């Protein structure tokens, strides 16, 4: 079998899940448009009752200039004018753990 679910059996599985989520449906028919309007009013769902979305839309100068001038030829501070993930330390810890485990074997 290899995998938990075989792709060729996916649809069947899905079908069964649906049977367990919606055991009851509203199957009684209506005789005219007024009854359909009433039924649509009665079966409204909050998650599907939003309004349509909105349309897409589009002195300190001297101090800033002096600051920019004073940051000339700066490798890192100039670029800015910061999320530490500690990747290197975690890597070092993993390497140390692996080396200690290897040493313990001998």
């Amino acid at each position: 079998d290899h995998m938990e679910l075989d792709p060729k059996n996916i649809y069947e599985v899905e079908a069964k899940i649906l049977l367990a989520t919606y055991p009851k449906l509203d199957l009684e028919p209506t005789k005219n448009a007024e009854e359909t309007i009433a039924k649509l009013e009665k079966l409204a769902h909050p998650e599907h009752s939003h309004k349509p979305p909105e349309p897409k839309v589009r002195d300190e100068a001297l101090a800033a200039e002096q600051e920019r001038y004073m940051l000339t030829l700066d490798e890192r501070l100039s670029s800015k004018l910061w999320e530490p993930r500690f990747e290197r330390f975690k890597l070092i810890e993993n390497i140390k753990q692996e080396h200690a485990e290897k040493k313990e074997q001998e």
Binding site: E4, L5, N9, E12, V13, K16, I17, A20
Partner: peptide, 7 residues
């Protein structure tokens, strides 16, 4: 056994 998977 699809029944077991669903359960």
């Amino acid at each position: 056994n699809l029944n077991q998977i669903v359960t």
